[PDB]
Subunit: 214 residues, 4 copies
């Protein structure tokens, strides 16, 4: 399975996939034939004209490890399926996204970037210590967790078809999206390209609305 | 690929599937483990309590040949993907659903059922003859086809996840649904049972709302 | 209520609407203020950049009378709500779309267009006569109706938000769509313009993908 | 507009509504009549048999102020529309949900509940102080906010139809849901009952799956 490390402790991994470029061609044609130049031209035609329903017949499942603030943005994509770790039902692990000092490149700051990174580490350590103190005193998990910060890592399974994935890439593989989710979208794109090369190349050429891919 | 004949000239065929019973278990648990009693109990637990999002991670693609009046009902299931043969873009084939005389069992009629079957065959033959006359006189396809009856066969690809498929089975594998679409739903159920035995058995035991399966 | 005649016997009527241009502005801003240049500029900004979720907070309900082949295309728009007259549960009325001879403008035909119109009327009359014969002999409605042609009129209620309506207009108020549904989309557009002038004008300027509106 | 205070600093307010009980009746019947015992019986019939599409023609818009951990759960309801305050684009206000000591009723704790409440207040104060320090040193908002806890208040507009609202009530007006979101769902229910009394009463009698309403 293709797995790609993201941020300091995150990842994207492909769990499963149904279909390939030919799945869209066969759905478009409503083919009996389960047997090229013509198939690739059909994908380009569909993409250039906005005929994207055939790409709904290609489906992916990913396992993603990401901070909560990234997952909040990601879960706004309603045309998909999600199942996520629960802070009601589980004790949550001490794992936080701590930005690199390079995260602040281009910003002039009155605290050195290495000190910003330190201050973030210090406050999330204090928050986790309070979380644990509450848990260990008998406070229910679902209440104790409310002190934890948005940079806490979470994990989820995401099942999404290629049409909705292309929408995700338009929006998230783009400079207007937050840099952290851009990094995830770059990995999603790499996996999509590997699994569906003709669809992906046609997408970049004719339909992709963002400004970071190729 | 599993294929099942339906009605006089129809079929349902499985084109592809992503996942199996374990896909729902792994999504529910957000598992790293890609490795029983415990997995089957989890599926039953989910089903008995209405926790059905994990079943969205199992996906099917079918190729279906059905009369238009069956397809009209089927396409009301919005949480799915469809691509269908077009009467704008193609010449449509002379293939009609002609009910068997047994279709009228339990109804007292003042025309013998064999004569009902004959009258249906006769009018659809006349309609197709008019369609062809129009086509052959230069009338555009998209206009000529408007004379064709609702028992004309059509074909489509359908991609659907197991949660939405279970909704389809609740509604269509049921005595209140039209008998013709019941027959399709029985075939969809057979394929679902073969591919996802634990999910299907748990569905019948705990969640299925209809009155025809088992 | 705004009502517009379409084709020979069809219509589109607005039944209800929630909101107006300001609904999108207030949702975008998450406003407490329930109180111009600034509001119109926000709508244009949203539209020009593809930020269309705020328009989901404007909702319409229409009552539409259209032939079945138009309704088949229309009902492919899944992000909406429909309720339609049933040929299982009701006797269907003798009302058919008969194209005008002008429908064939630009096509050279070997049957005069007035004779095409006559041949269509003649076959649908024969089909309805068979339908009625079957009904009156005790054949269940749901079976008798299968002989009826795709130009039979049907009626439905459609509830749709402005984002999905704009998608509908991109696709259906366009020369590539069948002329008959174009005529419906023109009426939908007129009603949308009346109810949401700033959104509609911004849509035409920045986002509309079709080639018939203004 | 109906507004209801929730938790310590939260609220639910109705912003707009389209339709009423009669909207579902008129959609079900595909009525021309825009004019009782019969209308209420139709709603009960629909509800008792699971025929819930007609209720999609009743739509609500709410403005909700809730902590992020409540909003995370709420936003899992995909069949709806949301627009939320952004921590990328805005400075976020110092407003946190601090549980009442009574929140821990039924739990034996080794820290007195008043001290739990104090410890939660203390850590979120420290987190906000770090957030502000980062902002005021020139760290971009979208990065500074990652230290803020899940009990931070957020606000959003929610547009939802009555069918999806009933699903929300089944799931969230229920003892298995987290107590905090139960409190929101109780307020949503009160507003739904006021606006759609026949639908709500039929829902409670025939369809509601939860264990807290009436
Ligand atoms: C840079 C950026 C900044 C953002 N800022 C904010 C913000 O400040 N606040 C905020 O709340 N959100 C914000 N968002 C989130 C944004 O509003 C969308 O929720 C998100 O981008 C998902 O887009 P989508 O609706 O196209 O995706 P999906 O929800 O996956 O929908 C896919 C497609 O299905 C259709 N669709 C799905 N459901 C409906 C429906 N109910 N009605 C109509 N059409 C539907 C649309 O065609 C849509 O494109 C931001 C997103 C980005 C990328
Ligand atoms: C016996 C029978 C008779 C019928 N008679 C008629 C009739 O006379 N007229 C008629 O028009 N239709 C009729 N229908 C069709 C019926 O109204 C539904 O369109 C169909 O059964 C599909 O059901 P669904 O909406 O659950 O499926 P899908 O559209 O696949 O939706 C699946 C689920 O997603 C949710 N959902 C999807 N979209 C929305 C949305 N926009 N809002 C809220 N929830 C949503 C719901 O939880 C729904 O159960 C009939 C169906 C049956 C089975
Ligand atoms: C000129 C023309 C010719 C056509 N020819 C054919 C044909 O030959 N055969 C045929 O079968 N169909 C045909 N169609 C129908 C077409 O494939 C679409 O079904 C229809 O245009 C509705 O578009 P939509 O999916 O954008 O709308 P909706 O279904 O309303 O969806 C709205 C938006 O929500 C999103 N969306 C909704 N559901 C999903 C999902 N499951 N996955 C991903 N994204 C989703 C997409 O962003 C979509 O744009 C044709 C349409 C047109 C206009
Ligand atoms: C007590 C409780 C505990 C929970 N625990 C967890 C947890 O540990 N982890 C977790 O990730 N989530 C958890 N959830 C969230 C839960 O999985 C659902 O996301 C949430 O309840 C919304 O339900 P829904 O999908 O029915 O709603 P919506 O998303 O609004 O969907 C409404 C209806 O539309 C249909 N539907 C919509 N989209 C699809 C689709 N893509 N495929 C098929 N059908 C569709 C279904 O019929 C559905 O009922 C929990 C929820 C509750 C109430
Ligand atoms: N908006 C819109 N969406 C669409 C289409 C469309 O025309 N418009 N259609 C393009 N279609 C095909 C199918 C087969 C071939 C081919 O065999 N050559 C070419 C195109 C199928 C369908 C898919 N979705
Ligand atoms: N992206 C980025 N990187 C940087 C800086 C910057 O402004 N932006 N600069 C911040 N600078 C200092 C030095 C001393 C103090 C102080 O003592 N208080 C504060 C800041 C040094 C320098 C380090 N690298
Ligand atoms: N309405 C609703 N929907 C839900 C759930 C829920 O509680 N309510 N949840 C049940 N969940 C799991 C996950 C793992 C195990 C297990 O490991 N034992 C058990 C249950 C996941 C999630 C899926 N959807
Ligand atoms: N389901 C079903 N099957 C049937 C019948 C029926 O009523 N229902 N009956 C209809 N019956 C006749 C006989 C003669 C004429 C006539 O000459 N006019 C008309 C009907 C015969 C019988 C045949 N089988
Ligand atoms: N893809 C995408 N979708 C979006 C947005 C976005 O940035 N990208 N956002 C634009 N947003 C607003 C809200 C208020 C104002 C204003 O007050 N000036 C301006 C913009 C809200 C949100 C809506 N949807
Ligand atoms: N759009 C359109 N309009 C038309 C025609 C046409 O080709 N296209 N033409 C078809 N023409 C005739 C005349 C006689 C016969 C015949 O007797 N067989 C058949 C066709 C006449 C003319 C009438 N108007
Ligand atoms: N699953 C399912 N969904 C449905 C229906 C159905 O039968 N099954 N139908 C019930 N329908 C009506 C319409 C009018 C009346 C009446 O006038 N008496 C009664 C029922 C409309 C439609 C709505 N959705
Ligand atoms: N819901 C709930 N309410 C409670 C308690 C409880 O267990 N659950 N109890 C906790 N109790 C104390 C007293 C002293 C210390 C200590 O000094 N360490 C710690 C706990 C007192 C009492 C207060 N009210
Ligand atoms: O780039 C963005 C900005 C916002 N949001 C959505 C996610 C949350 O529901 C809400 C606020 O997100 P933040 O701006 O706080 O990340 O809007 C996104 O999806 N992407
Ligand atoms: O059993 C039914 C009856 C109706 N419909 C939907 C399909 C059409 O959109 C409309 C009318 O269908 P008929 O009753 O004419 O089949 O309602 C169904 O989906 N299933
Ligand atoms: O312009 C078109 C052509 C096709 N279809 C969809 C509707 C039917 O599900 C199927 C076949 O439609 P016809 O081409 O037969 O109209 O594809 C459309 O929605 N619009
Ligand atoms: O009662 C619950 C529990 C979980 N979730 C969803 C929301 C988040 O996406 C994820 C984790 O939620 P918490 O258990 O951490 O609240 O699962 C709910 O929607 N409701
Ligand atoms: Cl840990
Ligand atoms: Cl043929
Ligand atoms: Cl009549
Ligand atoms: Cl403040």
């Amino acid at each position: 399975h293709m797995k790609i490390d993201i941020l300091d402790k995150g990842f994207v991994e492909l769990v499963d996939v149904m279909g390939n470029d030919l799945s869209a061609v066969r759905a478009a044609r409503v083919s009996f034939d389960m047997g090229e130049e013509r198939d690739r031209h059909l994908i380009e035609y569909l993409m250039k004209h906005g005929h994207e329903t055939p790409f709904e017949h290609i489906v992916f499942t990913f396992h993603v490890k990401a901070p909560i603030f990234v997952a909040r943005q990601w879960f706004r994509h309603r045309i998909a399926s999600y199942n996520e770790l629960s802070g009601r039902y589980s004790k949550l692990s001490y794992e936080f996204y701590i930005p690199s000092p390079e995260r602040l490149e281009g910003y002039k700051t009155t605290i050195p970037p290495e000190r910003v990174t330190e201050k973030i580490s210090e406050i999330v350590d204090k928050a986790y210590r309070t979380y644990l103190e509450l848990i260990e005193s008998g406070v229910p998990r679902e209440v104790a967790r409310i002190v934890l910060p948005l940079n806490l890592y979470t994990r989820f399974f995401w099942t999404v078809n290629a049409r909705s994935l292309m929408n995700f890439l338009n929006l998230r593989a783009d400079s207007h999206a937050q840099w952290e989710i851009q990094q995830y979208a770059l990995a999603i794109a790499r996996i999509f390209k590997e699994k569906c090369p003709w669809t992906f190349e046609a997408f970049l050429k004719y339909a992709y609305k963002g400004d970071i891919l190729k």
